[PDB]
Design a protein around this ligand. Structure first.
Ligand SMILES: CC[C@H](C)[C@H](N)C(=O)O
Ligand SMILES: [Cl-]
Ligand SMILES: [Mg+2]
Length: 364
């Protein structure tokens, strides 16, 4: 006998360039928590249903997990874009959802069954602008790019634009693209002609990486900030040596000294031979929230005896009240499921000259 927890993440499509890191973190969590006896001796079982890259696939995944797999709760989906369309399905069904990495404004407000462990763009994004200004105090002109078809990219760009204004900088252009675009020559040239000192990009991984590369090819020599959708070593293959120097805010640090982070980090490094990425840590934290909430609930009200609809509702109620020492730090939730947490960082992509390898270097 095991307790089923659904994992609805992008395991296929270009969205999997983000989702696969989340999957990795979830699998590390499953082993970590089951090796500690699961839920008071009862193992958890993570049930993976691929969402693919769109809304319909996410709705399908959620419905399968809820109806066929009888899960007590869902971790997912990967994108804010998917969450806005699919999370209402879980809300209506009274099945908890914990989002690992979805940072658009408005997600916890979807309903009483929607929580997230990832602080939103309003507190994440400004960090990287401040870091850019620290590295070059003479930045004056800023060009902003965003993926107009993606909910998170639109939410993130709003924050970047406001931060640029609040820092007293000149916003010389805002250029739009689609996450499915590979070619950005016109937008990149448009921006380059305005002589920006800083370029900010809010897209996802393949698109963001291609845009970074093309900006450099077209002769742009200024600073570049990537938003959260570029926050993966999967961009390295796309921009190669030309990824070097990109600044990306972080909501997780491998060097955070919490005991569970040490365990998580060591498990990750030993397997993948590099530091755990943010998305992996976030997915681990989401699974942790479910395991620790299930343990707390089970101690007060034995879960093996609770029928599924009531188990889902009681689990949701419990998780919202919990305090968790996770790889992300100590976190908890507001009454509507927003994360309460502290500490952000900024990292900078450092590529080897040949462009075949790189790393994220955390700024001190
Ligand atoms: C994988 C998460 C992505 C990068 C973004 N934070 C979003 O909310 O969609
Ligand atoms: Cl294109
Ligand atoms: Mg909520």
């Amino acid at each position: 006998n095991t307790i089923p927890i659904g994992i609805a993440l992008a395991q296929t499509s270009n969205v999997a360039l983000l989702g696969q890191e989340q999957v990795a973190g979830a699998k590390i969590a499953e082993k970590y928590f089951n090796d500690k006896g699961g839920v008071n001796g009862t193992p958890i079982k993570l049930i993976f249903q691929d969402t693919a890259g769109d809304e319909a696939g996410t709705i399908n995944a959620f419905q399968t997990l809820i109806n066929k797999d009888k899960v007590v709760g869902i971790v997912g989906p990967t994108l804010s874009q998917q969450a806005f369309s699919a999370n209402p399905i879980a809300e209506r069904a009274k099945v908890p959802v914990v989002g690992p990495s979805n940072t658009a404004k408005g997600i916890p407000e979807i309903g009483d069954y929607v929580a997230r462990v990832s602080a939103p763009v309003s507190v994440v994004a400004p960090n990287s602008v401040k870091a850019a200004l620290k590295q070059n105090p003479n930045i004056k002109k800023v060009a902003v790019f965003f993926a107009q078809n993606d909910a998170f990219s639109k939410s993130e760009t709003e924050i970047f634009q406001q931060t640029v204004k609040d820092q007293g900088l000149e916003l010389v252009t805002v250029q739009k693209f689609q996450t499915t675009d590979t070619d950005f020559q016109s937008q990149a040239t448009n921006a380059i002609n305005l002589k920006p000192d800083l370029v900010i990009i809010s897209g996802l991984a393949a698109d963001g990486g291609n845009l970074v590369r093309q900006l450099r090819e077209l002769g742009y020599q200024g600073a570049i900030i990537g938003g959260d959708g570029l926050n993966t070593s999967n961009v390295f293959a796309v921009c190669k040596a030309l990824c070097d120097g990109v600044l990306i805010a972080q909501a997780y640090s491998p060097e955070y000294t919490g005991e569970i982070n040490k365990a998580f980090r060591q498990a990750y490094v030993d397997q993948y031979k590099k530091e755990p990425p943010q998305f992996s840590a976030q997915a681990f934290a989401a699974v942790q929230v479910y395991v620790e909430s299930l343990k707390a609930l089970d101690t007060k009200n034995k879960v093996s005896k609770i029928q599924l609809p009531e188990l889902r509702t009681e689990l949701n109620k419990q998780l919202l009240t919990g305090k968790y020492n996770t790889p992300l730090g100590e976190i908890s939730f507001t009454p509507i499921g927003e994360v309460v947490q502290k500490d952000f960082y900024v990292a900078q992509i450092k590529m080897e000259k040949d462009g075949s390898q790189g790393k994220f270097t955390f700024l001190k």
